[PDB]
Design an enzyme around this catalytic site. Structure first.
Site, PDB file in Angstrom:
ATOM      1  N   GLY A  29       0.812  -1.202   0.000  1.00  7.95           N
ATOM      2  CA  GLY A  29       0.000   0.000   0.000  1.00  7.95           C
ATOM      3  C   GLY A  29       0.849   1.256   0.000  1.00  7.95           C
ATOM      4  O   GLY A  29       2.047   1.209   0.287  1.00  7.95           O
ATOM      5  N   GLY A  31       0.261   5.995  -0.329  1.00 10.22           N
ATOM      6  CA  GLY A  31      -0.492   7.143   0.136  1.00 10.22           C
ATOM      7  C   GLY A  31      -0.016   7.675   1.473  1.00 10.22           C
ATOM      8  O   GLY A  31       0.539   6.930   2.285  1.00 10.22           O
ATOM      9  N   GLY A  34       3.316   6.752   3.909  1.00 13.33           N
ATOM     10  CA  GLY A  34       4.361   6.176   3.082  1.00 13.33           C
ATOM     11  C   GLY A  34       3.979   4.842   2.470  1.00 13.33           C
ATOM     12  O   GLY A  34       2.801   4.491   2.388  1.00 13.33           O
ATOM     13  N   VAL A  36       4.122   0.639   2.340  1.00 17.71           N
ATOM     14  CA  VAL A  36       4.194  -0.501   3.237  1.00 17.71           C
ATOM     15  C   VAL A  36       4.602  -1.683   2.394  1.00 17.71           C
ATOM     16  O   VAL A  36       3.856  -2.114   1.518  1.00 17.71           O
ATOM     17  CB  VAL A  36       2.836  -0.799   3.892  1.00 17.71           C
ATOM     18  CG1 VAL A  36       2.892  -2.145   4.601  1.00 17.71           C
ATOM     19  CG2 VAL A  36       2.484   0.315   4.874  1.00 17.71           C
ATOM     20  N   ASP A 137      -9.002   8.885  14.274  1.00 20.59           N
ATOM     21  CA  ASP A 137      -9.000   8.670  12.831  1.00 20.59           C
ATOM     22  C   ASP A 137      -9.603   7.306  12.483  1.00 20.59           C
ATOM     23  O   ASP A 137      -9.098   6.573  11.627  1.00 20.59           O
ATOM     24  CB  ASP A 137      -7.577   8.792  12.258  1.00 20.59           C
ATOM     25  CG  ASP A 137      -7.572   9.202  10.788  1.00 20.59           C
ATOM     26  OD1 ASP A 137      -6.473   9.233  10.184  1.00 20.59           O
ATOM     27  OD2 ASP A 137      -8.666   9.499  10.241  1.00 20.59           O
ATOM     28  N   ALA A 141     -10.261   2.550   5.963  1.00 22.21           N
ATOM     29  CA  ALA A 141      -8.884   2.265   5.574  1.00 22.21           C
ATOM     30  C   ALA A 141      -8.001   1.933   6.781  1.00 22.21           C
ATOM     31  O   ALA A 141      -6.938   1.328   6.625  1.00 22.21           O
ATOM     32  CB  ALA A 141      -8.294   3.475   4.809  1.00 22.21           C
ATOM     33  N   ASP A 155      -3.177   2.453  12.769  1.00 26.86           N
ATOM     34  CA  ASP A 155      -2.785   3.853  12.691  1.00 26.86           C
ATOM     35  C   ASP A 155      -3.082   4.631  13.964  1.00 26.86           C
ATOM     36  O   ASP A 155      -4.110   5.292  14.066  1.00 26.86           O
ATOM     37  CB  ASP A 155      -3.472   4.523  11.504  1.00 26.86           C
ATOM     38  CG  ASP A 155      -2.703   5.731  10.990  1.00 26.86           C
ATOM     39  OD1 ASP A 155      -2.541   6.711  11.750  1.00 26.86           O
ATOM     40  OD2 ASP A 155      -2.254   5.698   9.822  1.00 26.86           O
TER      41      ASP A 155
END
Length: 280
Positions: A29, A31, A34, A36, A137, A141, A155
């Site tokens: 992934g 965006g 950074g 992964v 958040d 995603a 996250d």
């Protein structure tokens, strides 16, 4: 935890191979934050998230005393080398967001699986709050899926310990509660965000779509209350095992989570119960 050398993680990822896994690479992934990369460390595939220094520190401080089945696990990190890295357990099935849109051709998620994912995610948020932590958040995603499709909240770079108010407003617009958008910091906001996530699960639609009416998923709630549209109109058609009873039940929880008055919303424990009584 455990420290790592930069190159160590470079060699493990086939030298930061940014090419997607389906073409033969190590990129999973991208965006924001950074890239992964899929790593191979002692047969133990990891998730090498390569990179701001305060957020790199928070995630590790939070992951420190928050271990639970429904939260991604922090294995190690890399403070040496150029870009800072973070190592988590490898999450094979990616994000709920990518699975809800069948990214790369993966099979639609059955209603049954979605109920378990909603349950797992709620147990995760619950754990975070019992430990006096606010995610800030919560979103599609940021909910990862392992081999067995167990939901894992991820996250924690913006996560906070704990109603207060901040001058630095953060989060994702399409999932943000009213008070959160005004700078308020409170667990009640995570619930609201989760509510948007429940709508994603029910409809299979992304939180925001410019070419759509409404453009913000959260507003379909008003279309339904104004009885100008029904929940059946929004149910994801890429399923065949969703009984009207439990779909309406999850929508009931979602609607409650999306209440404009933060004090009018149920707490995570209540959300856990309702979701549990939904499959019972």
């Amino acid at each position: 935890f455990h420290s790592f050398s930069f190159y160590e993680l470079k060699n493990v990822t086939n030298n930061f191979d940014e090419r997607p896994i389906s073409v033969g690479g190590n990129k999973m992934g991208e965006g924001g934050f950074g890239v992964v990369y899929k790593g191979y460390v002692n047969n133990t595939t990891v998730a090498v998230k390569k990179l701001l220094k305060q957020q790199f520190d928070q995630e590790i401080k939070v992951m420190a005393k928050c271990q639970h089945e429904n939260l991604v696990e922090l294995l190690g990190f890399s403070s040496d080398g150029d870009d800072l890295c973070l190592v988590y357990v490898y999450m094979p099935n990616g994000s709920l967001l990518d699975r809800l849109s069948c990214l790369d051709g993966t099979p639609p998620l059955s209603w049954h699986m979605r109920c378990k994912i909603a349950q797992g995610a709620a147990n995760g948020i619950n754990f975070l709050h019992e430990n006096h932590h606010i995610h800030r958040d919560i979103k599609s995603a940021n909910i990862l899926l392992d081999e067995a499709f167990t939901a894992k909240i991820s996250d924690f770079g913006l996560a906070r310990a704990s109603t207060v108010m901040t001058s630095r407003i953060v989060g994702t617009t399409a999932y943000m509660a009213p008070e959160a958008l005004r700078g308020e910091i409170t667990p009640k906001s995570d619930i609201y965000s989760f509510g948007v996530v429940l709508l994603e699960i029910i409809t299979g639609l992304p939180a925001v779509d410019e070419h759509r009416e409404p453009q913000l998923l959260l507003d379909i709630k008003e279309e339904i209350e104004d009885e100008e549209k029904t929940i059946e109109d929004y149910i994801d058609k890429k399923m065949n095992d969703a009984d009207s009873t439990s779909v309406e039940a999850m929508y009931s929880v979602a609607s409650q989570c999306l209440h404009e008055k933060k004090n009018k919303r149920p707490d995570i424990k209540k959300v856990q119960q309702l979701l549990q009584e939904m499959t019972a």
